Amino acid sequence: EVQLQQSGPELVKPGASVKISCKTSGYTFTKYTMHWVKQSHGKSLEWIGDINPNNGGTNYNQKFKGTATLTVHKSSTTAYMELRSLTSEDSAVYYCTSKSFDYWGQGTTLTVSSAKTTAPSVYPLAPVAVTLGCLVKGYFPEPVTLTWNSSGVHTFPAVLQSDLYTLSSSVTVTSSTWPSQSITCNVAHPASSTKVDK
């Protein structure tokens, strides 16, 4: 299986530096040029630059020179991209691509901000088929996972307010199951927090 496993999401101060990983597999690392693409807010894909593995030959977009630094590790078949002097304008999704844009990385989500991490407060949403819900209020880094026990589930995209994200989730189950059978909502991360509800 050819796979390009990039590093996880990161939060960084406006000024900090970051180095994203992209460990490849299943193909001749050195036969192809590794590319790095920037995915801004929405639909804005930008070619940052590329590097030729083993030979370390670079080619940068004039716009990303200075901040970007592509380097490689022929041995661990891992490409790297260092982004220095980060600002809020550098928050986006980052992909690495190979075999002429045929293989893409999973993407690395980066948030540049002084806002402190925060554990969310999950709240059970009961009424007053059966429709129910779970509200996860106030967490800072964008990644969070919501599952229900284990499908009328409807997870809604997070919306940021005052440096805190807010996400909700509704699940529609039948009356002959609830409350005899529990419906729990599992929440994970923000500040290493894992919470189960009803």
Binding site: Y95, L135, H154, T166
Partner: protein, 213 residues
């Protein structure tokens, strides 16, 4: 920089329809490449070198065009085919992409399934109170939701959030969360959120009274 403007930006096509999305390059290019990215996923090379279909791509997809204007064409829109298609040019430096063309499935207008919830005791004891409102499975996405507290519209504190079109029935779902202080909550009784949608001559109302409904 060779700018690549895509047209249209977003479109709704019914299944079985013929779609043709174009891509104009500011300066002449040799080939054009097309990418398909679905929400939450990385891009997928769809058609490269203008005409070549990558592995996996269905034969209803075809690439054409020359020099300055290129185009992708779906002979019959499929449910699966909804996504954003980017055009890319590698014929010059640096490499550039198109604005994107978002494809959405056109379907039968539905009305939303509204549900209202009062602040949880956990939240209430915490010092704040948020009344949530789920408006499930509707089409079109155009929907207006108003919060009324004792017949009075609240504008600030409302947090809306639509999902990306449902893969199974092709409808969108909304979620409005009005947030107030525990104090403000315990002072007003009738909380109402109404959806003035396109299928409703009269707004879909869902209401609840703070103490007994």
């Amino acid at each position: 920089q060779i700018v690549l403007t895509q047209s249209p930006a977003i479109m709704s096509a019914s299944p079985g329809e013929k779609v043709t999305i174009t891509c104009s390059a500011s300066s002449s290019v040799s080939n054009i490449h097309w990418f398909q990215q679905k929400p939450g996923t990385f891009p997928k090379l769809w058609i490269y070198s203008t005409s070549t279909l990558a592995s996996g791509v269905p034969g209803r997809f075809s690439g054409s065009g020359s020099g300055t204007s290129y185009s992708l064409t779906i002979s019959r829109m499929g449910a699966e085919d909804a996504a954003t298609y980017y055009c890319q040019q590698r014929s010059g430096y640096p490499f550039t992409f198109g604005s994107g063309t978002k494809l959405e499935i056109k379907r039968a207008d539905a009305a939303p399934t509204v549900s209202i919830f009062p602040p949880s005791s956990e939240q209430l004891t915490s010092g704040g109170a948020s009344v949530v409102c789920f408006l499930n499975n509707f089409y079109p996405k155009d929907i207006n939701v108003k919060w009324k507290i004792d017949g009075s519209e609240r504008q600030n504190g409302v947090l809306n959030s639509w999902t990306d079109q449902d893969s199974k029935d092709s409808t969108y779902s909304m979620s409005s969360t009005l947030t107030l202080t525990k104090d403000e909550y315990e002072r007003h009784n009738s909380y109402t959120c109404e959806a003035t949608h396109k299928t409703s001559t009269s707004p879909i109302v869902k209401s609840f009274n703070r103490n007994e409904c």
